[PDB]
Enzyme design. Structure first.
Site, mmCIF file in Angstrom:
data_model
loop_
_atom_site.group_PDB
_atom_site.id
_atom_site.type_symbol
_atom_site.label_atom_id
_atom_site.label_comp_id
_atom_site.label_asym_id
_atom_site.label_seq_id
_atom_site.Cartn_x
_atom_site.Cartn_y
_atom_site.Cartn_z
ATOM 1 N N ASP A 76 3.134 60.771 25.754
ATOM 2 C CA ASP A 76 1.957 60.221 26.406
ATOM 3 C C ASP A 76 0.704 60.446 25.573
ATOM 4 O OD1 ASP A 76 3.548 59.495 28.519
ATOM 5 O OD2 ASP A 76 2.972 61.192 29.790
ATOM 6 N N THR B 78 -3.520 53.739 26.734
ATOM 7 C CA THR B 78 -4.273 54.961 26.500
ATOM 8 C C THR B 78 -4.018 55.531 25.115
ATOM 9 O OG1 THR B 78 -2.518 56.361 27.385
ATOM 10 C CG2 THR B 78 -4.044 55.386 28.925
#
Lengths: 509, 514, 73, 510
Positions: free
Chosen positions: A47, A80
């Site tokens: 992530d 992101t």
């Protein structure tokens, strides 16, 4: 407090060190980052989401990069990575050389036209998907669940998340934008079948509303949502003094219960057997419900009734005077109290302001339910984005190189100063073909130039490097889809962001 | 602070070996029991790959992950945690060498897949269907017990192991959740691992040996009050009015003598004889005067046999939990052909056994009740989990590293795909497979290659499943020996390896997260 | 929970036992030097013999304590 | 190992090293002990009695160490003392000397999966033929020199000179009053410490002997209901002196009123509790004293737990505080109760004689406890060794005279078997010499001199050393035909138990 290159090179020291492992953490071959918790723990992350949270701030510009990773998380929840990648990937090359050419400025308007040639490149390569056909979306929507990959419910939850944002799409602003998600919500269901994890209308209330006495079901009778003062008011709409005397005591209780009365004169007329009181809920008030043959509903809140306002489509009553049906429990209404597992599930279907629809997600357990719940996300988010933007674009080096030479061609088209940012921004595209190959283990160099050659022939129209096959290929072939939604949204952000921290030549206090 | 690329990757392979370096001394009968006075701060002893981890308080981050994956394995297995940990860092060695020769961790893992398959496929290819029989189950028992303990004490644990496995088959349970019952017993010797066809009860009574020998049980397991209380309480505690306390205290004793005289009514109704015992068993305590009133009549009233007892009593004995004495039948209670209140060491351990419809057949282990008795308490349980799998699977392959010279050597013979992209993960995979057969073989003072080449070729020649003799580090034939690997055991450790071996390979950077 | 083994402690025992005898070396026929001994209590402490100052002196030694107790015996 | 983290006190080097090292170094006591020795250890647990000891158990009671083995191993050594009193000063040195024999093989690289086996295998081979080298047995336990002979290794092992009368005294104690049918009791026959007289005067007075003073009268009847009370008489309300002269001539009386008439009802209900002897854990007030005599209740002015414990043990007593009229849950056990003068001291004597529950009590008379405890230690480890509950002790050659016997058994058997265990078994044929050395050390010669000349005796059974001139140059004291003999029981244990310790302690790496 920073200034000049110390900001600018420090800006490079902000997002890039963030985006360093992130490219390994990105792509379909994404390589997780190891983390070391302050406890001595570990978190393995592909992530761009989790890293910035845990990792302490390495530069003030990073605190700004964090939020544009948030802004893209706010906008989507994916990208992101790339927003701090792309913007930080812009920061390393152009600025200092172009501060040696003396400007933040020429780079900005370059970034702006470094933005548009992609937006110019996209409309060809970003080409309309059909939101009508599920599979025409599901190919994008499998492309959403394929990388994060919980595979079993990456199958069903998509068609669920397809139907989720579909069933939550009426969306009417007059412009028919589809950002519309919140109506689609998961449901935390103990026990039950791993299937029937599915989209139902309204909001079946899993949060705070679970009762032995709702009866077991209230169907035609209304669910009544009180913002308003189910507790007594000692005056007309108001309250008066307490009891110091024999004279005052009898005077008080009249208008008290009469208010509860004149409430439930106008509250009872609309036929609840369940009144859900989020405020005004109190012993004597709910004891009155207990005595009114209308379920006393406590431990319940605004979200509940706002979800019930989103469930039957009620409007939580802001008027102490004159409650009605379409106020609370709109339509004939369904309040269905079902225990799948031991939790009473308030099921309020029959939504008015229709197309506001939650998602009933039932595993045999919360994990296998959460496995539906997580796979739902990227699907329904991209579904939302596909329903927002009914287009798709080939992923990987396709968008990267087709814009890369474009910006380069545009840089040659300009052959000016801003070309140099176009020269810098075109390469920012190509770190992803690197990134994709920087995962698989081949030499991106041979393929970069070959992807240059893929542009030399095909302009890398649909032809990118596909991260998991690590080779330069059509993505309309592979059905690998970034949307003009997901990408341009991600690309839009970083375009501003690199400008932002480049709009910073001075950090102060 | 950060560690880039190889740095965080160096931390990976670094911590892995000391784990295995325990295991090279912890694996199989060749391995050695490990006393930990440090690990939790407790004074401990253990053999297992999973257990030694958790016993320690481990400050290293790489090893914070390590106690995790063998846990789920040891749950099923009981062995291979002593093994899977070996293959991981042995794989981390290879995977390191290939990035040491240069490579990405992705193009490393890519070759694991077909290699993992063909070996996981070789699990099928080899898998030895062994008709599951106390004899064969003894072998699968002792191999995990020998793995963790003396072959001597393995066979000591093996019986009670193979005892209650047919007895849990008697319960039609392929796994084992009951007759898993391992009862420590106070003794000068841990040498005794026994079986009780029924429970080992806790307290006969605080007034002991009431009816100590009950050869026909009518079991009332009752959370009731024969001790309600004898002491001074008002509402149940100390109130602000002292004179108001003892007013309810007698009625507390009287409500006991309610239940007591009910037993005088009950033992009468139930028994009418001290011959076929009516047995009070209380989840609470029991007043000695309740006991006295009951004991002199030939009644045994047990107190504070735990809720596990209250189940297993209600369960193993065909028993009941009836929370009011009142008047009840013998058939309103369960029955056990032996209830005997037995003292070896301090506590009198009442043995309720010959229990009709036994739902619990207790495995007695006598001993000092030290880590020692625990050291034979875990291996049995671990061996139980092994034969549990041996009950679960109908296929058990040999142990003693007999599988990999059948497995790895095949993958050593061929890349499953026979293409180099696999070789990058196949060399790593197929290599790491041979650690267990080679390690204890070389641990015995017998060089791996010369030891492996035999057991390799002895499989290649004979087509044989060919074991290692773990203490003598020689090629053996583990198909006949009885060192045998459950298809349930061996499968997950492969996954347990792979699942933990990829991401840590795929994580090249670590940073302080707060 | 402290011990010293072997000759090193053994020989170490004698001097602690001997030094007090180096005081009494002749305290029966008294002549020699007598120092008025003021202990940490402000107590001026003397003797007509060795024993009373021996009564005043204490040791952590079992050894130096024994012959003390023995001379006191 | 390769981590900054995890844990261990043992392993790697350490397992091969530290786990063997200090476990041996523990043996220094047992290296100087077990068999006649003048060598002793002053162990100060700080009691203001500075305790001479050779007994490993109460040597190791203080000793604390991080070495998990040496941390543990004292267990098996103390588990030994539980099983036999003698042979415990043998346990620690034998394995301890037998340990680094394997560590030298570890220097040779002979595995932990290997070496200790041969020990264990020869631990069998010992306990295989160990009962074969049994010779005598202690048969009549009323008899002195069948009991005192077993004693004559055991106390001897602990301490040398005092042993002989002790062995007599202990056999004259007749711990056989316990038929030793499976019956023995450490509290009923008890040691009773008496300051002064002789330790040759130290006797066995049967009953329960309390050097505490019998106060006032003796029991009303000899089967007492024995009042054992922690604080029956603390005083009720005490007298005072205010002015450094008198407080008030008036205030004197009312407190005796509370004292007397309470201690009236107190001791009247010490009479109404039916106490024939009131045994006071605390002091006595002269009023209750007067009451204890009028109400006809034998009074014990003060009681240590040494009383109160055995009282609770034997009498079924519970030592109780009393400001109130009592009740006896103590009752008596005893069929007899006395003031006797023993140690020539007025002594509280509770008494009876049976086979079972019978109190027949050692009374030790010595100027100190360090006298009456370490000797008792020396004493009771023979009394403990008397405890077999196989009446015939199966007396082997005493004084470790079976060392040379098994030594050539194991070394010949170490020759038989092949493989690295043949060494370990031959290494097991080695540590025999430890106590023969431990003797020859306190005796002053090397076991080599001893054991080689006792390798010349080959099969002997009798000759083995000790502390004596015979144990120095001649290498010979006759420890089978002696008067000095030891049971097979402790032989079954120490060789196996010290092995049981040494079994896994090299295996333990963490």
């Amino acid at each position: 407090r920073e200034s000049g290159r110390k900001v600018q090179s420090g800006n490079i020291n902000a997002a890039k060190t963030i985006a360093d492992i992130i490219r390994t953490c990105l792509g379909p071959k994404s390589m997780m980052k190891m983390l070391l918790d302050p406890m001595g723990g570990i978190v393995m992350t592909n992530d761009g989401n989790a890293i910035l949270r845990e990792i302490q701030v390495q530069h003030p510009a990073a605190k700004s990069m964090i939020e544009i990773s948030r802004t893209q998380d706010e906008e989507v929840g994916d990208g992101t990575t790339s927003v701090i990648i792309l913007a930080g990937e812009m920061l390393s090359v152009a600025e200092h050389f172009l501060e040696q050419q003396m400007h933040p400025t020429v780079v900005i308007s370059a970034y702006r036209k470094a933005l548009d040639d992609m937006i110019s490149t996209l409309k060809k390569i970003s080409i309309p998907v059909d939101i009508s056909d599920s599979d025409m979306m599901l190919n994008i929507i499998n492309s959403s669940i394929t990388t994060k990959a919980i595979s079993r419910w990456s199958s069903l939850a998509c068609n669920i998340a397809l139907d989720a944002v579909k069933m939550v799409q009426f969306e009417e602003n007059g412009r028919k934008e589809i950002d519309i998600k919140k109506y689609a919500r998961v449901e935390k269901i103990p026990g039950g079948i791993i299937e029937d994890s599915c989209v139902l209308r309204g909001v079946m209330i899993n949060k705070d509303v679970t009762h032995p006495r709702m009866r077991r079901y209230i169907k035609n009778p209304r669910i009544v949502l009180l913002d308003s003062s189910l507790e007594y008011k000692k005056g007309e709409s108001q309250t008066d003094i307490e009891i110091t005397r024999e004279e005052d005591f009898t005077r008080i209780l009249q208008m008290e219960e009469e208010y509860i009365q004149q409430l439930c004169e106008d509250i009872i007329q609309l036929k609840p057997d369940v009144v859900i009181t989020e405020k005004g809920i109190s012993d004597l008030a709910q004891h009155y419900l207990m005595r009114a043959n209308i379920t006393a509903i406590r431990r319940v809140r605004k979200t509940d009734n706002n979800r019930i306002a989103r469930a039957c489509g009620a409007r939580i009553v802001s008027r102490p005077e004159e409650l009605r049906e379409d106020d609370v429990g709109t339509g004939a209404g369904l309040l269905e109290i079902k225990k799948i597992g031991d939790e009473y599930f308030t099921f309020i279907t029959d939504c008015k302001d229709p197309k506001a629809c939650t998602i009933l997600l039932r595993g045999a357990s919360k994990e296998i339910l959460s496995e539906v719940e997580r796979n739902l996300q990227d699907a329904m988010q991209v579904c939302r984005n596909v329903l927002l933007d009914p287009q798709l674009v080939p992923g990987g080096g396709a968008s990267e190189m087709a814009v890369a030479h474009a910006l380069t061609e545009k840089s040659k088209a300009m052959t000016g100063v801003e070309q140099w940012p176009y020269r810098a921004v075109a390469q920012a595209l190509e770190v992803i073909p690197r990134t994709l190959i920087q995962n698989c283990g081949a030499s991106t160099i041979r393929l970069l130039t070959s992807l240059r050659a893929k542009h030399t022939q095909e302009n890398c129209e649909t032809w990118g490097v596909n991260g998991e096959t690590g080779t330069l290929v059509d993505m309309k072939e592979l059905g690998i889809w970034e949307p003009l939604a997901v990408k341009l949204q991600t690309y839009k952000t970083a375009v501003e962001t690199a400008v932002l921290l480049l709009r910073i030549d001075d950090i102060v206090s | 602070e950060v560690a880039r690329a190889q740095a965080a990757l160096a931390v990976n392979i670094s911590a892995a070996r000391g784990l295995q370096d325990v295991l090279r001394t912890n694996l199989g009968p060749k391995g050695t029991m490990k006393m930990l006075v440090s690990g939790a701060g407790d004074i401990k002893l253990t053999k297992d790959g999973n257990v030694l981890l958790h016993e320690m308080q481990i400050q290293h981050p790489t090893a914070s992950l390590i106690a995790k994956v063998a846990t789920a394995q040891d749950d099923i297995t009981g062995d291979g945690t002593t093994s899977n940990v070996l293959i991981i860092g042995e794989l981390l060695k290879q995977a390191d060498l290939y990035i040491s020769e240069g490579l990405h961790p992705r193009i490393i893992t890519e070759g694991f897949e077909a290699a993992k398959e063909k070996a996981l496929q070789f699990l099928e290819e080899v898998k030895v269907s062994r008709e599951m029989d106390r004899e064969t189950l003894i072998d699968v028992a002792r191999t995990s017990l020998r793995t963790k303990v003396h072959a001597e004490l393995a066979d000591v644990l093996t019986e009670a192991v193979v005892d209650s496995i047919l007895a849990i088959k008697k319960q039609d349970e392929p796994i084992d959740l009951f007759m898993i019952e391992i009862m420590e017993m106070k003794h000068k010797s841990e040498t005794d691992t026994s079986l009780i066809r029924g429970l080992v009860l806790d307290h006969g009574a605080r007034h002991p040996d009431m009816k100590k020998r009950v050869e026909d049980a009518y079991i009332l397991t009752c959370n009731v009050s024969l001790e309600y209380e004898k002491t001074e309480v008002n509402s149940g505690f100390f109130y602000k009015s002292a004179e108001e306390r003892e007013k309810l205290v007698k009625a507390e004793r009287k409500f006991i003598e309610d239940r007591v005289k009910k037993i005088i009514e009950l033992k009468r109704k139930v028994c009418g004889d001290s011959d076929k015992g009516f047995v009070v068993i209380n989840q609470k305590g029991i007043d000695p005067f309740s006991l006295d009133a009951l004991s002199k009549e030939g009644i045994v009233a047990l107190r504070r046999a735990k809720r596990r007892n209250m189940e297993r009593l209600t369960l193993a004995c065909g028993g009941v939990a009836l929370n009011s004495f009142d008047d009840l039948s013998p058939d309103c209670l369960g029955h056990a052909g032996l209830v005997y209140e037995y003292t070896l060491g301090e506590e009198k351990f009442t043995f309720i056994e010959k229990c009709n419809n036994p739902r619990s057949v207790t495995l007695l282990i006598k001993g000092p009740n030290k880590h020692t008795l625990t050291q034979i308490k875990d291996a049995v349980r671990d061996g139980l989990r092994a034969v549990k799998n041996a009950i679960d699977d109908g296929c058990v392959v040999p142990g003693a590293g007999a599988v990999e010279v059948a497995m790895a050597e095949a993958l050593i013979k061929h890349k499953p795909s026979v293409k180099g992209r696999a070789q990058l993960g196949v060399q790593a995979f197929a290599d790491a497979l041979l650690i267990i057969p080679k390690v204890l073989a070389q641990n015995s003072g017998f060089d791996l290659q010369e030891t492996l080449v035999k057991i390799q070729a002895e499989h290649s020649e004979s087509g044989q499943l060919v074991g290692v003799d773990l203490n003598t580090g020689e090629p053996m034939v583990a198909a006949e020996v009885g060192v045998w690997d459950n298809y349930c055991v061996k499968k997950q450790l492969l996954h347990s390896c792979t699942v933990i071996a990829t991401n840590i390979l795929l994580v090249d950077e670590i940073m302080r997260a707060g | 929970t402290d011990s010293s083994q072997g000759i090193p402690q053994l020989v170490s025992n004698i001097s602690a036992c001997q030094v007090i005898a180096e005081a009494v070396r002749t305290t029966l026929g008294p002549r020699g030097m007598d120092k008025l001994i003021v202990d940490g209590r402000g107590k001026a402490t003397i003797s007509n013999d060795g024993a009373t100052i021996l009564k005043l002196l204490d040791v952590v030694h079992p050894a130096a304590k024994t012959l003390v107790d023995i001379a006191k015996s | 190992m390769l981590k900054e983290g995890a844990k261990h006190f043992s392993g790697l080097e350490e397992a091969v090293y530290r786990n063997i090292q200090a476990c041996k170094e523990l043996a220094q006591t047992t290296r100087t002990a077990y068999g006649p020795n003048g060598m002793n250890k002053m162990v100060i647990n700080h009691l203001e009695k500075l305790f001479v000891t050779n007994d490993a158990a109460t040597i190791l009671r203080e000793l604390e160490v991080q070495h998990p083995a040496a941390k543990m191993i004292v267990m098996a050594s103390h588990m030994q003392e539980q099983e036999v009193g003698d042979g415990t000063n043998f346990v620690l040195v034998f394995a301890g000397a037998l340990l680094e024999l394997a560590e030298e093989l570890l220097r040779i690289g002979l595995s932990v999966s290997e070496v200790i086996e041969g020990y264990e295998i020869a631990c069998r081979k010992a306990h295989e033929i160990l009962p074969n080298l049994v010779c005598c047995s202690a048969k009549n336990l009323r008899d002195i020199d069948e009991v005192s002979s077993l004693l004559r290794t055991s106390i001897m092992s602990k301490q040398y000179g005092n042993e002989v009368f002790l062995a007599k005294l202990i056999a004259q104690a007749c711990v056989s009053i316990f038929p030793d049918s499976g019956h023995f009791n450490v509290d009923n026959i008890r040691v009773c410490k008496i300051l002064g007289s002789g330790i040759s005067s130290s006797s066995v007075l049967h009953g329960m002997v309390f050097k505490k003073e019998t106060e006032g009268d003796v029991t009303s009847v000899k089967d007492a209901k024995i009042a054992v009370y922690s604080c029956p008489f603390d005083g009720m309300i005490t007298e005072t002196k205010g002015t450094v002269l008198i407080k008030t001539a008036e205030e004197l009386m009312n407190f005796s009123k509370g004292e007397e008439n309470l201690m009236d009802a107190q001791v009247k209900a010490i009479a109404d509790t039916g106490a024939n002897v009131v045994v006071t854990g605390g002091k006595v007030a002269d009023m209750a004293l007067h009451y204890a005599n009028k109400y006809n209740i034998m009074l014990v002015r003060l009681n240590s737990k040494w009383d109160l414990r055995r009282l609770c043990k034997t009498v079924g007593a519970t030592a109780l505080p009393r400001l109130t009229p009592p009740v006896l849950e103590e009752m008596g056990h005893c069929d007899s109760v006395y003031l006797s003068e023993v140690g020539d001291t007025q002594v509280v004597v509770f008494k009876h004689e049976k086979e079972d529950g019978a109190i027949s009590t050692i009374v030790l008379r010595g100027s100190t406890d360090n006298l009456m405890d370490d000797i008792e230690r020396a004493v009771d480890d023979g009394v403990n060794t008397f405890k077999v509950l196989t009446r015939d002790k199966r007396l082997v050659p005493g004084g470790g005279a079976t060392e040379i016997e098994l030594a050539k058994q194991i070394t010949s058997y170490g020759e038989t078997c092949p493989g690295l265990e043949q060494y370990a078994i031959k290494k097991f044929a080695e540590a025999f010499e430890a106590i023969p050395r431990a003797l020859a050390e306190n005796s002053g010669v090397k076991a080599n001199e001893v054991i080689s000349k006792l390798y010349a005796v080959h099969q002997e059974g009798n000759k083995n050393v000790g502390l004596d001139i015979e144990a120095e140059v001649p290498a010979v004291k006759d420890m089978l035909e002696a008067g000095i003999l030891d049971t097979y029981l402790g032989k079954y244990w120490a060789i196996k138990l010290a092995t049981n310790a040494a079994v896994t302690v090299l295996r333990v790496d963490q």
